[PDB]
Design a protein around this ligand. Sequence first.
Ligand SMILES: Nc1ncnc2c1ncn2[C@@H]1O[C@H](COP(=O)(O)OP(=O)(O)OP(=O)(O)O)[C@@H](O)[C@H]1O
Ligand SMILES: *[B]([O])([O])[C]([C][C]([C])[C])[N]C(=O)[C]([C]C1=[C][C]=[C][C]=[C]1)[N]C(=O)C1=[C]N=[C][C]=N1
Ligand SMILES: Nc1ncnc2c1ncn2[C@@H]1O[C@H](COP(=O)(O)OP(=O)(O)O)[C@@H](O)[C@H]1O
Ligand SMILES: [Mg+2]
Lengths: 167, 525
Amino acid sequence: KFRERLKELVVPKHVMDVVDEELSKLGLLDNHSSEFNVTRNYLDWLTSIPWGKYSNENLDLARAQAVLEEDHYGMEDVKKRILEFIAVSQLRGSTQGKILCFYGPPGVGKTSIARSIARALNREYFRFSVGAEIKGHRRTYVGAMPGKIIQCLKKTKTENPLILIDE
Amino acid sequence: IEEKFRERLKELVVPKHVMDVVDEELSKLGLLDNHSSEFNVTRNYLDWLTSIPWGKYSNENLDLARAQAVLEEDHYGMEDVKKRILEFIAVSQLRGSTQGKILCFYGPPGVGKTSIARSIARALNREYFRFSVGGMTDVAEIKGHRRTYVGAMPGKIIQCLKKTKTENPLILIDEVDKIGRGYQGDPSSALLELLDPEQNANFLDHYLDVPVDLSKVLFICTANVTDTIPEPLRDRMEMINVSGYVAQEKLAIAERYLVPQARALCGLDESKAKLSSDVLTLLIKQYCRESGVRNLQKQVEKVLRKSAYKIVSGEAESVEVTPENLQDFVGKPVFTVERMYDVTPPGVVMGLAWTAMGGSTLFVETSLRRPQDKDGSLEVTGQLGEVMKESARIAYTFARAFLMQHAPANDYLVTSHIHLHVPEGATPKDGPSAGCTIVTALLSLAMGRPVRQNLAMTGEVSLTGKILPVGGIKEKTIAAKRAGVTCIVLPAENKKDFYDLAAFITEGLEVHFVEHYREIFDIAF
Ligand SMILES: Nc1ncnc2c1ncn2[C@@H]1O[C@H](COP(=O)(O)OP(=O)(O)OP(=O)(O)O)[C@@H](O)[C@H]1O
Ligand SMILES: *[B]([O])([O])[C]([C][C]([C])[C])[N]C(=O)[C]([C]C1=[C][C]=[C][C]=[C]1)[N]C(=O)C1=[C]N=[C][C]=N1
Ligand SMILES: Nc1ncnc2c1ncn2[C@@H]1O[C@H](COP(=O)(O)OP(=O)(O)O)[C@@H](O)[C@H]1O
Ligand SMILES: [Mg+2]
């Protein structure tokens, strides 16, 4: 069923390459052993993170202003700045470049504003705190886990989420 | 082998994300051979997996009256903590199922922080578990080791879940400020993973390697000082301050718990060694003036062991402890006289101070420095801080002004060279209070009149004569009561602080709340 877990999903070439290679290498090894489960979990990780799955971006500025104004009473200046950022992104075609940053006294609405931004752009929200570890470990059974960004991709099952690097 | 492990998964509710794991592992025992190392590795791995209490709880007592009774049985009046536990029960009962908080008690040594967790777990009917964290260097105690290693083991929290046979225990994590910070595996980060409600729902132990749901446990942390608790850890706890006790609280605690336990230990009953309550009051007053109760317990044990020696050495056959021969049992008193002046001369006035060992009572002596009644001066001694010297200057100016407006032909305080001293010259002292005390000292020196005898006053004064609030009203009132003051004077803006004190503290005190200094003058004369 692993092929079904990425059938309808658009896959690149050099990814299906490693997928088939690991399936053949897993047919080689013996099932239910200290060599089989490792490669099984790795091939699971290859077939879990999306490749062609997206989220239709919310480009409209009126809907964005509405979803920003619903929550977060006040903040009119931060709201104006966010609207202007979305306008520049819509006019530039993309959203890369500078990375936004909110700073101020504590308990003022800097995490919830990022959640509301994510809800605005219809991007899937994900937060990971940086208060090495963002790159994952290696498969010598020491760290059998990918990084937190790969887990973001798996969780949100969308290639364009909104990750929040809090604090 | 398989039969017992699959039977053990009967009275539980095993979640799927671990039921498939235990099934995959069971599928290996049939293949492996009973002689191999992998066999025993997976055998005790399955032992650990099936021994975890996967869905069961305890019959948590959500009755409020019973919880209050069992809380008030074990300890004497730690109300700020019992109130929190009762509100926790009330909330956990309003919103349906059992809950889990992360509380932290901080305070001086010996106030009951660690001692109360067991009675709290008895009140909630939970399974109490405790482990100290001070001095801990490695994360393997919190996390554990990968079961690949030879003698791998789960760790303290999984062992707690196995030993309590429940997954809503009360885990007392003791000494969370003395936690070591060896960065080659930092235990503070494991403690953050434990005490972080957003992620403690999946506590991934390095041995189990399946997440456990630790969101229904009541973590309680104990600290002596909060300023060395890691900041991220401190930002996930409810700091509840367990303060010290006063003479009457200490007496109740002694009579109810400390003396009976010390009698059970030393083997003396009230027929052999009589510790009356007057002796205990004198002891608490002159020897044990700290915040906790460990020193008082040691003093009680001291008296009891000396009486025990008097009996065993065949000398007394019975020991009567009277307030006259207490020195023979405990030595020289630490605090003796409580006041330096019995009747105050025209110049000196009693003030009140704050200290960690209860309050204090200091006097403000003033004296003519040169022979006379070009302007007068003020020399100020007594190890005074900058704020206190400035407040003395302010009090001097206002005293000049007030004496000019009150008795315009006095000429004192203007042409006289005065020396102001706050005795006990060795100890340093600071604070904006005693401004009214200094004004009163100067005025009583200028008019040649001693103030009311049993009168004490605290309060900041401004240049126009307004009386401003001060701090430490509890200790100052305790000190004035202890020294035999009948009339106390406080700023009018400390009325709430004074009426917030326990009733026995302010029993026979005649308090006066003032706004300006003219009222203090009308009272002190
Ligand atoms: N309010 C109280 N009522 C009854 N007994 C008390 C009270 N406060 C303390 N005790 C007794 O005194 C002892 C206090 O020791 P405890 O373990 O509470 O200290 P602690 O709060 O952990 O301080 P530290 O952690 O700084 O040593 C306990 O044995 C307890 O029985
Ligand atoms: B006051 O509240 O400012 C007061 C004035 C005192 C010197 C008559 N100061 C103190 O009580 C200080 C503690 C303090 C409290 C608040 C602010 C600053 C300082 N106490 C002492 O200085 C002291 C001195 N000797 C013995 C005991 N206490
Ligand atoms: N303008 C606002 N409108 C509504 N809720 C707010 C607003 N500002 C702050 N809050 C609330 O206060 C809390 C702020 O915490 P948060 O902003 O996450 O802390 P930090 O700013 O340190 O990240 C949030 O729970 C948020 O709901
Ligand atoms: Mg303790």
